[PDB]
Amino acid sequence: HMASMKKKGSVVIVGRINLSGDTAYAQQTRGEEGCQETSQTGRDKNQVEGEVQIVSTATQTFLATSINGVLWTVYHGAGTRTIASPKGPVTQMYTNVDKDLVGWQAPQGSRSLTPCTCGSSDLYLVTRHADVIPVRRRGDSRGSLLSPRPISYLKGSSGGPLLCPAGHAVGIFRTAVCTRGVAKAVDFIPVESLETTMR
Numbered sequence: 001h002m003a004s005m006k007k008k009g010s011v012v013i014v015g016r017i018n019l020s021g022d023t024a025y026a027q028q029t030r031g032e033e034g035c036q037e038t039s040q041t042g043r044d045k046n047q048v049e050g051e052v053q054i055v056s057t058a059t060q061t062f063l064a065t066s067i068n069g070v071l072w073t074v075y076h077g078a079g080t081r082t083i084a085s086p087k088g089p090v091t092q093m094y095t096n097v098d099k100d101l102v103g104w105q106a107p108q109g110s111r112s113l114t115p116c117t118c119g120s121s122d123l124y125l126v127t128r129h130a131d132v133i134p135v136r137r138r139g140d141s142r143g144s145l146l147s148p149r150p151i152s153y154l155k156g157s158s159g160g161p162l163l164c165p166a167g168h169a170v171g172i173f174r175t176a177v178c179t180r181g182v183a184k185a186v187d188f189i190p191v192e193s194l195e196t197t198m199r
C-alpha cells in the first residue's frame with residue numbers, strides 16, 4: 001500500500017578509470033557498504049576526479065563519462081535515477097530513451113573530455129577494467145573491434161568513452177554487437193548526438 005512504497009535509489013560513483021598518465025587503471029573510491037548507504041541517502045561527500053567514473057546502482061555497475069561539463073551514461077543502466085552528490089540526489093539534466101542516453105551536471109572536481117573535431121575513424125574504447133581496445137569506426141554509431149572478445153569483457157562498460165587518437169571524446173559506448181556471445185563490434189552514441197542534445 002502507498003505508505004509502504006520505497007523510492008528508487010541514486011546512482012553512486014564508486015570509482016574511476018584513471019587516464020591521466022602513461023598507464024590506464026581502475027581505482028575504487030567506495031566499497032559496497034558505502035555505496036548502498038550513499039544510494040539510499042543520495043549524499044556523497046567523496047572528492048571526484050577524472051573524466052571516466054565507475055557508477056553503480058543496487059543491481060548494476062557501469063560507467064559514466066564527462067564531456068563538456070555533463071556526466072553522461074546510458075538510460076538502460078541508470079534509467080531516470082538521480083545521482084548522489086555532496087548536497088543530495090541530483091536530478092538528471094538530460095534524459096533521452098530514444099538515444100539510450102542520460103546525463104547530469106558534471107561533479108565538482110571532475111574533468112571533461114572535449115568533443116572530437118577530427119573526423120578520425122581510428123578509435124579507442126575504454127572499459128571498466130581499464131582496457132583500451134582499438135576500434136575502427138564503421139558508421140555514425142558503430143565500430144568494429146580489431147580483436148573480437150567474449151561479451152563478458154565488455155559487460156559493465158556501457159557509458160564509457162570511445163576516444164579519438166588525440167584523446168577527444170568520439171562517443172559513449174552503448175551496447176556490444178555479438179555473434180554466439182562473441183563481441184565483434186560496438187554501438188555507441190556519437191558525440192555529435194550529445195552536442196545536439198546540448199545545443
Ligand SMILES: [Zn+2]
Binds near residue numbers: 164
Ligand atoms: Zn578528435
